[PDB]
Design a protein around this nucleic acid. Structure first.
Ligand SMILES: [Mg+2]
Ligand SMILES: [Zn+2]
Lengths: 653, 1322
RNA sequence: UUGAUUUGGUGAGAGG
DNA sequence: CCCTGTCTGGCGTCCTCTCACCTATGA
DNA sequence: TCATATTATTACGCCAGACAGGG
């Protein structure tokens, strides 16, 4: 094909074939003319090298080249490599009915639906709109319909809302690593040009909103719409397939809204008043007569389902707060009140959704995940939880700790001038006292943040955990840890030079005080190493996933029982410290090999082919069972696949 | 004192440390390099003169003619820079070289030549540099980026661990020339010394010694010291200097002088060495088992029999001693091979060597270098004597000889460019010393070992390539030269020099397209130091340590401005104060510290000098004399930051900006940010689009002025003075007399570049910021460019930001924006698109430019003329027609008429047409010809008249010393004026002098206007080939919308999520809504706490601005304003600014206070910024709460947010990642040729690549049918997709799959080998 | 039967 | 003949966007 | 325009896999 101009941009294979044919014509003419031996040996040798260069170029000595010094691409180089036919056109293809744009939040969504712009919706659904327009009778030929949607008249938007309605789409973030990076939603049309994506689902995609882009794909046929609704819908992916942990965990704003809501303070409006239900708890919060955290006896009615599928009501007075009753208005029936009675950080809300999924199933857990997200966003908005310059409280003891460390390094260097100690022991003593002073500065600031609030109630003072903003952002587990809040208030440790060894003079200034020049330069050593490590680590991570899915590639659950009695011996793992990973983490949802004897004497505690779900694992933990002989995939007797028992639990089902 | 645009709005400058050295001109690398390349510099160094003095005089091989050189020159460019960018030509200059051919007779080395000839011949055109550091290569504006490469000269590298798999270190030594062959020496784990040349095969290294006419005895004289065994009374005693016994085991009985010194068994200590030196012990009698392992040094022959006893480098046995003892060689020289220190590496290499003499050494080297083709005496000797020893093909430069003498601890630094014998022998000796223990290796990241190439050096190397090709051509033509019938252009050819230099300036890895969307981005793409390029490392291979920051980067390379991704730390950006050394290294300023008193003299150092000295820190407290106020101060000695005494230091850092670059020293509160977020902040700050209304960062660093001036986007005044201000077209500046030349009366007319295309489709536009009749000084700014506000640097705009969660709309990093941001057009940026249309003659006749557009009805003829091409300016969108450009015989006629792309709108701002000499439609082409024709003459006379008016007045003005008669001077009006004779009196020649001016003015205006018409009267100017050349410039105006990307200066990225109404915003109790709500949860994790101090200090800045706006709106007489302005400019600790405010004439207070009513601008410098107590104290001067936090109500519910929130002003930028350049969708359109799958991209209307990991993700589910349509029907299978489109539009969602086409393409490509791949049974 | 060329390939820069 | 340096081949992350630049010869 | 047919740089880092050398 010619490019834009008047010349033909010719392929490399035409150069290869044209040279082989030029040389072959020369060799036929020389064998006509009866040239001597050395001429036809060079001629046949040039033909041999020409054919060998056509088939696999460059496997012989230095590869031939046309323009300019770059070698030209042969047939084997049309097959092999990252850009051959397998990895570039047969395993991955470019795809019609597909789109791509920048994502944004839209928190009004339910977690089975996503926002999708009107312009992308009218472009991706052109044939469905054509079929709908031809069914009504508005137009006749196909051309008329293409002019109608090229003009975008007033009647095609009703056609578009009637082709969207129950038709899922596959949203896909561009580095898809696991299967939760392709999820199917239902579109809700957006005035705009940005895909609105429900926030909880973001923790599955590893999608923040700093400029990310996602692709939309349309399931055309009817089996694909049913696969998008029944396998790939976003309500169906609420557990990560790598383990048992929920992947629709509430990420960052909503845990701050909950941690500010369900908490307490030793005096507020409406301290110690009594309330006849959670409805008037929210009515007292809204009218302006109590506070969101003010401890209060309420009367709640928790439904415990202690019978066989029957929900029994028990109503009682819990000494709780106002916010815990307001959050109890959203909890479904079966969960007990003690799931909200605590302070609800991030681990606690994750196990709240996990206990809701284990007890009440899927549909209350989907609707309760949405109600969690809505009430977290609403009371985080009502919280006004800012961040200031005064929130990072400097320890008053920090300067005396630094001067005591400076006196200690002065003593060690005065011994170094008089030669009493060795150089390695000097370096070790300096790193040890700066580690000790760093830990003391961190404990000073951590006391000064975790219990700084001291407010009286009806008399003398009484202390409590603080409502400092950076401390709630750390204690809630929203964003922040001990180390980051340590570096914003206490000293930021002993940064290390790229030699791998540590630097004996630390960075005694945090970020609220100013770093001077040398301290920031040592900091840049420590951070440039981290950016280089991530930007080169990602290649090995991706190539590891490729090698793993191409060694796996074949193995499909293809039976129901291999009919064996062999399986590996799951014990808890112990390195030499305290018992690291308990047996309930290793033998959860894996089918036992032989029947586990109860630890007393010769009892059939569990039978020999039972899946060990949570109830069986609790009856294992009560009896303190030593180790379980359980069925493993490597002991499966199935030819060409893995039987259904030797795999185990479904992990997301 | 201040200049007059400095008194407009003087920024409140925090900063305690007095700066001693002002910031150098930020584009000096590019400009000094290219000014070195083109300059007439006698003594030859460096430049084009070095190239001509290397290549000339050319003499042929005794051809008795010798073309020599005289002088070169560069004429005027035929195209000035603007019309050069418009037309598409290079911005070049013709290189006029004088060449003098002299031709000899027979037998004239000394004889006078028989004939000469000389002419100013023309070779190439070299591209000149624009005054801002850019080129214009083919219409587009490109930048050569300075390379960072390994210096020429020896490097002793180790590779300690990875080879041999045994923990044994190697030690190699590379002699890197600037031009020529690479010579490396290297150990191997058998402890033998090996040479290799140009990474070829491995030769044992002493063969190169045997190639330098060294016998074995001379080599053993060099690398070993002699131990003397004297044949004596018994057992052949030994001379023993006691140094040689250091650290070894006494094998025998050590006794002398009748006294037993050291017995057998104990090791020899240094006290025993002191005993032997005190006892004067040299000669001791050895056993016969001591010599039975040693090695002879030189040769010995049996004298009477006349044959050889032993060759040099032979180990000794007892019968060999019985051979040599009985002959009569009394002295025996042995090689001291210490296992600890003095190893026998050369000797064992000589045992590996298969050669014996010089000739076989050269034959083996020639068989290494060029294999197959035979090794004869002449050929191998010419090879080895031109490998390193001729001035042509091997040349360590001055840098290389300096590094080569410095790494060998030589005294001198200047020497010859080639190597010698002694240099190779010294490199081998230093390598052996490093193996022995003494001396150490070099590291490669050390910036004293790392040179910078720049524009002049790279263009000079390419020009030298072109000159050696043209001298091989001149040697070709001259031996075939017949005389005298040629003159020097049948010999010389302008083609290879121009070809090579356009090859470099067009298609190189460093001549690259300028990131031009921002004044910052221009000025920080020109200051870039790339590790990549030719001769340097690559992106996808190396490494870990060259991507990492080394302690010699302090003040030479920015530590924090490097792009994240595949090339981190290869694309380093240069620091603020760092110049370039004479040799090309990076030297940075320091303040010389003789004693306690830190002197204000500066002195530049590089990293091979910074290690020796002790260099202080920039911020160490010194008071009123330069004495360090402490008795101990943090310094750094040899790359190690440590605490030293008060009086030991020799240098101090100049200023505290000097570590970082001009991208990341514009970030205020840098010292409070994390390093990662400062990196992301600087890299995004390069990417900002210029807004429609430029707006002055309230929290800046004061480096905005230097960046906005030094990047040439503003019209800085050349000569000071007043103003005439026609300005609609140009600023006209009358020049004050002191800066004004005696002749050339002269007033400066500045050209404002109005709305035009940048390289990133943004809009570069200049607007005058001076009024009419207003004084300006030299160096002052006159016209504000893109993203500038009164000479400062305004990338983004400053907006009222609340930190709070607001109903989830700012969840991860999103940003929630009011409607007051989008109503005011305060981010509504202007983009410009160039669209070309050509009507090339592909085939079947030429294409045509006519409105008579076919099939398509009166929906073609609309935004055009009555008969062709888009008219001028309307609101064109997508699917319109701009240039009717369609052929007949291409019913069978078609629609190639360049239209408007899908999704864009805009206004046609400009239409250019230098089309195929004929474009005129009706008669428009010649219609405008007369318009410009009459235009030229008008201005030509006008300008003359303008000067005439000034001259006429000047005539009368001077008419006083030679006729002041006012009533006798107003005779003729436009006729004559002076009808008197001044003669002398006090020299007023001045009348006669001015008479010549007007006389010459009219006389030159005619000629000036004569060429004007000549130039005017023309078809048009462009190249050939291309026929119809119509370029149409749209200008879309994009506002802001849900999906764009905004960011501050600290790394806080955001995709603006909801564009709220004004009512729903969080308003404080005063009533004002907040503009933009960010999210506080980003701040504890991303530890960029500097955005909060910018928020509080910007809140205080607008607090002062609101206070001045009240004092000036509710208008007060200027005493209260000058008192409040004086309080605002004093404010707090000891600073540098204070102000001299009572000298502002009672009006410059008011104009300042008119320019401060939007907020008082505050300079918070980089590491010496504003402390927190001064932020609180400034928040107390304004009436704002001290905590920085205001209680805010909610616009929805009207009720207070608990726990008061932070509101302030952050300077937020709009990055050029706009959402309606990313939105794309595809149902069905065009595909590729080879494959049946859809095309890729957006400009091609193509679909999404459903890659490999998405296929694995669908396999991970049970999506077997979704994947089947995802790779068969939607993508590739042609029968499947046509049946599917018809099945969809019938109302039948069902796929008829078939087989993909690209798999049959795979079958034919595999089958086109000798491979029979098939498809089996049904 | 009612219309047309980038993918090809290199180099440089950018986003997640 | 079993260890052994040494040499040769074969890997090295996905998705996207913008721009420019493309063989010499020649009676 | 229409056939003629290929030369004067080096500077990754493992990690298997095959090969001549020698105790
Ligand atoms: Mg991101
Ligand atoms: Zn099995």
């Amino acid at each position: 094909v010619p490019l834009d101009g008047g010349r033909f941009a010719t392929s490399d294979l035409n150069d290869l074939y044209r040279r082989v044919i030029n040389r072959n014509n020369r060799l036929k003419r020389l064998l006509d003319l009866a040239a001597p031996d050395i001429i036809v040996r060079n001629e046949k040798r040039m033909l041999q090298e020409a054919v060998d260069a056509l088939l696999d170029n460059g496997r012989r000595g230095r590869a031939i080249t046309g323009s300019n010094k770059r070698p030209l691409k042969s047939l084997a180089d049309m097959i092999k490599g990252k850009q051959g036919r397998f990895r570039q056109n047969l395993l991955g293809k470019r795809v019609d009915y597909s789109g791509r744009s920048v994502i944004t939040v839209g928190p009004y969504l339910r977690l089975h639906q996503c926002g999708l712009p009107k312009k992308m919706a009218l472009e991706l659904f052109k044939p469905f709109i054509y079929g709908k327009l031809e069914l009504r009778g508005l137009a006749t030929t196909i051309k008329a319909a293409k002019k109608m949607v090229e003009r975008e008249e007033a009647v095609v938007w009703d056609i578009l809302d009637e082709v969207i309605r129950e038709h899922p789409v596959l949203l896909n973030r561009a580095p898809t690593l696991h299967r939760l990076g392709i999820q199917a939603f239902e579109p809700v049309l957006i005035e705009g040009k940005a895909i609105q994506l429900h926030p909880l689902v973001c923790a599955a995609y590893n999608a923040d909103f700093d400029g990310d882009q996602m692709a939309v794909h349309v399931p055309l046929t009817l089996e694909a719409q049913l696969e998008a609704r029944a396998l790939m819908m976003s309500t169906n992916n609420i557990l990560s397939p790598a383990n048992g942990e929920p992947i629709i965990v509430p990420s960052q704003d909503v845990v701050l809204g909950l941690y500010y809501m369900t908490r307490d303070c030793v005096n507020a409006k409406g301290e110690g008043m009594v309330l006849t239900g959670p409805k008037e708890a929210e009515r007292l919060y809204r009218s302006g007569l109590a506070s969101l955290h003010a401890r209060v006896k309420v009367r709640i009615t928790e439904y415990e389902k202690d019978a066989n599928g029957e929900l029994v009501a028990k109503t009682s007075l819990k000494d709780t707060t106002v916010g815990r009753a307001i959050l109890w208005m959203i909890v479904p029936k079966g969960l007990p009140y003690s799931i909200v009675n605590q302070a609800l950080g991030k681990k606690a809300i994750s196990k709240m959704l996990n206990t809701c999924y284990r007890i009440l199933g899927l549909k209350p857990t989907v609707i309760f995940a949405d109600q969690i997200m809505y009430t977290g966003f609403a009371y985080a908005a009502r919280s006004g939880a800012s961040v200031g310059i005064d929130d990072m409280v400097i320890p008053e003891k920090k300067h005396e700790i630094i001067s005591e460390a400076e006196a200690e390094v002065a003593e060690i260097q005065e011994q170094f001038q008089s030669g009493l100690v060795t150089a390695g022991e000097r370096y070790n003593k300096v790193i040890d006292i700066w580690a000790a002073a760093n830990d003391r500065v961190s404990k000073a600031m951590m006391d000064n943040l975790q219990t700084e609030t001291v407010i009286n109630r009806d008399g003398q003072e009484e202390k409590q955990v603080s409502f400092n903003s950076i401390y709630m952002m750390a204690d809630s587990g929203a964003r922040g840890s001990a180390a980051q809040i340590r570096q914003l208030a206490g000293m930021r440790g002993l940064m290390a030079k790229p030699d791998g060894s540590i630097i004996e003079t630390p960075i005694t200034a945090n970020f609220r005080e100013g770093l001077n020049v040398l301290q920031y330069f040592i900091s840049t050593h420590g951070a440039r190493k981290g950016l280089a490590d991530t930007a080169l680590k990602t290649a090995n991570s991706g190539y590891l996933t490729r090698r793993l899915v191409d060694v796996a590639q074949d193995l499909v659950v293809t039976e129901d029982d291999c009919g064996t009695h062999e399986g590996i011996m799951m014990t808890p793992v112990i390195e030499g410290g305290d018992v690291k990973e308990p047996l309930r983490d290793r033998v959860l949802g894996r089918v036992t090999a032989e029947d586990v004897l109860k630890p007393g004497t010769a009892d059939i505690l569990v039978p020999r082919n039972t899946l060990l779900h949570e109830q069986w694992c609790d009856l294992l933990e009560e009896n303190s069972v030593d180790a379980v002989k359980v069925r493993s995939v490597v002991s499966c007797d199935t030819d060409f696949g893995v039987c259904a028992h030797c795999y185990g639990r479904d992990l997301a089902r | 004192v201040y200049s007059y645009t400095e008194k407009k709005r003087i920024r409140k400058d925090f900063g305690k440390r007095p700066q001693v050295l002002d910031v150098p001109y930020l584009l000096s690398i590019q400009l000094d390099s290219f000014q070195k390349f083109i300059e007439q510099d006698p003594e030859g160094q460096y430049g084009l003169e070095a190239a001509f003095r290397s290549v000339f005089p050319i003499q042929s091989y005794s051809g008795n003619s010798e073309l020599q050189y005289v002088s070169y020159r560069l004429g005027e460019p035929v195209f000035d820079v603007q019309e050069c960018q418009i037309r598409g030509v290079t911005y070049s200059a013709p290189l006029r070289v004088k060449l003098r051919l002299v031709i000899y007779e027979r037998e004239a080395p000394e004889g006078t030549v028989k004939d000469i000839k000389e002419q100013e011949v023309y070779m190439g055109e070299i591209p000149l540099m624009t005054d801002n550091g850019t080129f214009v290569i083919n219409g587009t504006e490109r930048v050569i980026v300075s390379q960072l490469h390994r210096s020429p000269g020896v490097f002793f590298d180790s590779d300690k661990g990875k080879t041999h798999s045994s923990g044994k270190v190697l030690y190699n030594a590379r002699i890197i020339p600037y031009r020529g062959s690479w010579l490396d020496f290297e150990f191997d784990p058998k402890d033998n010394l090996f040479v290799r040349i140009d990474r070829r095969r491995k030769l044992p290294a002493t063969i190169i010694l045997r190639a330098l006419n060294y016998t074995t005895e001379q080599i053993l004289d060099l690398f070993f010291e002699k131990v003397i065994f004297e044949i004596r009374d018994n057992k052949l005693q030994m001379e023993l200097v006691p140094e040689r016994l250091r650290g070894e085991t006494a094998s025998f009985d050590i006794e002398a002088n009748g006294k037993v010194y050291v017995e057998k068994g104990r090791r020899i200590t240094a006290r025993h060495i002191r005993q032997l030196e005190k006892d004067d012990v040299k000669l001791i009698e050895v056993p016969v088992e001591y010599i039975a392992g040693k090695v002879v040094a030189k040769d010995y022959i049996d004298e009477s029999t006349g044959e050889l006893i032993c060759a040099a480098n032979m180990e000794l046995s007892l019968d060999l001693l019985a051979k040599l003892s009985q002959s009569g060689h009394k002295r025996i020289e042995t090689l001291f091979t210490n296992d600890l220190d003095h190893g026998p590496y050369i000797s064992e290499t000589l045992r590996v060597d298969p050669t014996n003499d010089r000739l076989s050494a050269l034959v083996e080297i020639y068989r290494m270098m060029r294999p197959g083709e035979p090794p004869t005496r002449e050929a191998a000797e010419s090879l080895f004597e031109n490998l390193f020893f001729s001035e042509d093909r091997y040349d360590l430069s001055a840098v290389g000889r300096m590094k080569f003498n410095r790494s060998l601890l030589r005294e001198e630094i200047e020497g010859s460019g080639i190597l010698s014998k002694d240099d190779i022998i010294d490199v081998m000796k230093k390598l052996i010393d490093i193996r022995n223990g003494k001396g150490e290796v070099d590291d490669i990241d050390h910036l004293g070992n790392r040179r910078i190439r720049s524009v002049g050096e790279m263009a000079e190397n390419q020009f030298r390539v072109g000159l050696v090709r043209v001298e091989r051509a001149v040697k070709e033509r001259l031996s075939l030269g017949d005389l005298d019938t040629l003159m020097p252009q049948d010999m010389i050819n302008a083609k290879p020099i121009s070809a090579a230099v356009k090859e470099f300036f067009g298609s190189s890895q460093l001549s690259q397209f300028m990131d031009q969307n921002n004044p910052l981005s221009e000025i920080t793409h020109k200051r870039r130091i790339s590790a990549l390029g030719p001769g340097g490392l690559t992106r996808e291979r190396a490494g870990f340590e060259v991507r990492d920051v080394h302690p010699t980067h302090y003040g030479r390379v920015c530590p924090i401005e490097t792009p994240e991704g595949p090339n981190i730390g290869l694309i380093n950006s240069l620091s603020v104060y760092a110049q370039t050394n004479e040799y090309g290294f990076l030297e940075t300023p320091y303040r010389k510290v003789t004693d306690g008193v830190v002197t204000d003299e500066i002195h530049y150092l590089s990293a091979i000098e910074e290690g020796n000295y002790v260099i202080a820190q920039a911020n160490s407290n010194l008071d009123e004399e330069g004495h360090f106020v402490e008795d101990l101060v943090t310094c750094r000695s040899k790359g190690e930051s440590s605490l030293f005494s008060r009086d030991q230091v020799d240098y101090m850092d100049v200023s505290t900006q000097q570590v970082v670059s001009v991208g990341a020293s514009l970030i205020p509160f840098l010292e409070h940010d994390d390093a990662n977020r400062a990196l992301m902040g600087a890299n995004m700050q390069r990417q900002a689009v210029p807004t429609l209304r430029a707006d002055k960062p309230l929290v800046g660093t004061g480096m905005e002025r230097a960046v906005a001036v030094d990047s040439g986007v503003t019209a800085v005044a050349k000569r000071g003075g007043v103003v005439q201000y026609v300005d609609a077209s140009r600023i006209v500046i009358k020049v004050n007399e002191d800066e004004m030349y005696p002749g050339e009366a002269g007033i400066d007319i500045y050209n404002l570049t109005k709305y035009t295309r940048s390289n990133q489709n943004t809009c570069i536009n200049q607007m005058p910021c001076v009024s009419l009749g207003e004084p300006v000084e030299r160096g002052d700014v006159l016209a504000d460019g893109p993203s500038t506000d009164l000479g400062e640097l305004a990338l983004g705009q400053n907006m009222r930001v609340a930190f709070m969660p607001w109903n989830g709309y700012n969840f991860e990093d999103s940003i929630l924006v009011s409607e007051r941001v989008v109503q005011e057009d305060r981010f509504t940026t202007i983009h410009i698109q160039e669209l070309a249309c050509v009507s090339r003659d592909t085939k079947l006749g030429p294409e045509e430019i006519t409105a008579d557009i076919p099939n398509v009805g009166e929906a073609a003829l609309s935004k055009l003329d009555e008969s062709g091409i888009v008219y001028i300016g309307a609101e064109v969108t997508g699917g319109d027609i701009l240039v009717g450009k369609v052929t007949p015989k291409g019913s069978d006629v078609k629609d190639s008429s360049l239209r408007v792309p899908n999704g864009v709108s805009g206004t046609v701002i400009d239409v250019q047409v230098f089309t195929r000499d004929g474009v005129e439609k009706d008669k428009r082409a010649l219609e405008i010809e007369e318009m410009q024709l009459k235009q030229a003459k008008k201005d030509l006379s006008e300008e003359l008249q303008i000067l005439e008016a000034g001259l006429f007045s000047r005539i009368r003005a001077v008419l006083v010393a030679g006729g002041v008669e006012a009533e006798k001077l107003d005779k003729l009006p436009r006729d004559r004026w002076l009808e008197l004779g001044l003669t002398d009196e006090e020299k007023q020649n001045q009348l006669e002098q001015l008479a010549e001016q007007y006389d010459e003015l009219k006389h030159e205006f005619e000629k000036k206007l004569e060429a004007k018409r000549r130039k005017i009267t023309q078809g048009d100017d462009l190249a050939p080939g291309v026929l119809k050349i119509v370029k149409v410039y749209l200008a879309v105006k994009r506002r802001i919308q849900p999906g764009d990307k905004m960011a501050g200066r600290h790394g806080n990225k955001g995709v603006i999520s909801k564009i709220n109404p004004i009512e729903d915003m969080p308003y404080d109790e005063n009533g004002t809504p907040v503009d933009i709500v960010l999210n506080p949860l980003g701040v504890p994790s991303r530890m960029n706490i500097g955005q909060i101090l910018e928020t509080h200090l910007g809140m205080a800045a607008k607090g002062i601005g609101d206070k001045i706006n009240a004092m000036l709106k509710q208008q007060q007489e200027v005493a209260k304003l000058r008192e409040f302005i004086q309080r605002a400019y004093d404010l707090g600790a000891d600073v540098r600014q204070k102000v001299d405010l009572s000298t502002f004439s009672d009006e410059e207070v008011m104009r300042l206070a008119e320019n401060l009513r939007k907020g008082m601008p505050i300079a918070t410098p980089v590491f010496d910024g504003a402390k927190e107590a001064e932020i609180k104290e400034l928040l107390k001067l304004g009436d704002l709460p001290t905590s920085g936090q205001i209680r805010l109500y909610d616009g929805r519910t009207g009720e207070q947010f608990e726990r008061p929130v932070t509101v302030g002003y952050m300077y937020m930028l709009k990055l050029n990642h706009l959402v309606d350049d990313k939105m794309h969708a595809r149902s069905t359109g065009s595909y590729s040729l080879v494959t049946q799958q859809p095309l890729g991209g957006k400009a091609q209307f193509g679909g999404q690549r459903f890659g490999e990991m998405e296929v694995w993700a669908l396999e991970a589910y049970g999506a077997a049918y979704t994947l089947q349509e995802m790779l068969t029907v939607k993508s590739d299978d042609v029968n499947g997709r046509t049946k599917m489109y018809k099945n969809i539009v019938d109302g039948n969602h069902q796929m008829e799959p078939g087989m993909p086409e690209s798999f049959n393409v795979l079958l034919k490509e595999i089958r086109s080998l000798g491979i029979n791949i098939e498809l089996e049974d049904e």
